[PDB]
Amino acid sequence: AEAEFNNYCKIKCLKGGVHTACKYGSLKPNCGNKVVVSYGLTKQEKQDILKEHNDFRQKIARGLETRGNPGPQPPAKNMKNLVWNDELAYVAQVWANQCQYGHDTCRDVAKYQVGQNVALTGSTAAKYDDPVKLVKMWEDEVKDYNPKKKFSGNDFLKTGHYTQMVWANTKEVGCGSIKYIQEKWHKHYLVCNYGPSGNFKNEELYQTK
Ligand code: NA
């Protein structure tokens, strides 16, 4: 939470926009009339999310992901595990606390531009998916990823989450979470910020082996 003391109002994102942590200088949920059940991630949840990201990156890197359009995904020569980043997690959490599904306009930090994956599920029952389950939703996009084509040649709407997960240049991840009730839908919102950002148009996901 130490990051809350950084002045994000001085951060400038490539496409402009007021930084999320400048817009909201509070770490307290700000969800209109929605009923916030809980917010944040436990030490174990953060570790589980990190492990899932890394187990996935390694699966891909070792040439073990058979899914694709067509599969399999090629092995990687430069795939390193991600490490959890508290600042990314903080900014992700501030965004999550707005309960506004989608991407926030400016989330970059002092060190680099930042990418982001969001996940949301709603149920009529008072139950909330495990964070890892939401992460796997992003992974499954790999079924629609065609490695015979470069990154820009693929369908971003269908694979944009997958590509950010396996972006070789991305080295850090930090996520935020919140469970709320909106018009009787029990929703779990997961926001994960990545540093440095991935999904750059003229680049490849990772160096193939
Ligand atoms: Na296939």
Side-chain angles (χ1 to χ4, degrees), residues 67-71 143:
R67 300 176 294 175
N69 187 43
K143 302 147 188 283

Side-chain angles (χ1 to χ4, degrees), residues 180-195:
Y180 58 90
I181 303 167
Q182 185 196 336
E183 308 172 296
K184 297 194 189 301
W185 281 106
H186 297 274
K187 311 194 182 188
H188 190 179
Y189 185 37
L190 179 71
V191 176
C192 287
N193 286 8
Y194 302 79

Side-chain angles (χ1 to χ4, degrees), residues 81-207:
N81 292 324
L82 303 177
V83 293
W84 188 270
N85 185 285
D86 291 330
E87 164 171 41
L88 297 183
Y90 161 70
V91 180
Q93 188 66 55
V94 173
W95 179 225
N97 287 345
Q98 304 318 299
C99 295
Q100 286 176 44
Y101 182 74
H103 293 299
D104 50 339
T105 300
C106 178
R107 74 192 79 83
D108 297 349
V109 299
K111 190 175 179 187
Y112 40 48
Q113 289 184 72
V114 175
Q116 181 188 76
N117 280 338
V118 294
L120 178 72
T121 58
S123 167
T124 54
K127 282 288 182 169
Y128 311 82
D129 296 327
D130 190 292
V132 170
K133 185 171 178 177
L134 298 177
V135 172
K136 284 180 169 298
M137 298 188 310
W138 301 328
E139 290 173 17
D140 297 338
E141 296 190 336
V142 67
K143 302 147 188 283
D144 298 317
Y145 194 77
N146 183 359
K148 302 187 78 301
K149 296 179 179 177
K150 300 179 179 183
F151 169 57
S152 61
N154 275 276
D155 191 72
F156 175 71
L157 243 57
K158 309 169 67 173
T159 63
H161 301 118
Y162 161 69
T163 54
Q164 174 61 91
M165 281 192 77
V166 304
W167 201 263
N169 283 350
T170 296
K171 304 305 203 304
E172 313 199 65
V173 61
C175 316
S177 172
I178 186 170
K179 305 174 183 189
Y180 58 90
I181 303 167
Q182 185 196 336
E183 308 172 296
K184 297 194 189 301
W185 281 106
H186 297 274
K187 311 194 182 188
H188 190 179
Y189 185 37
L190 179 71
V191 176
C192 287
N193 286 8
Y194 302 79
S197 180
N199 288 357
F200 284 105
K201 55 207 294 65
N202 40 51
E203 292 178 22
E204 254 65 298
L205 304 186
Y206 51 81
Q207 189 190 324

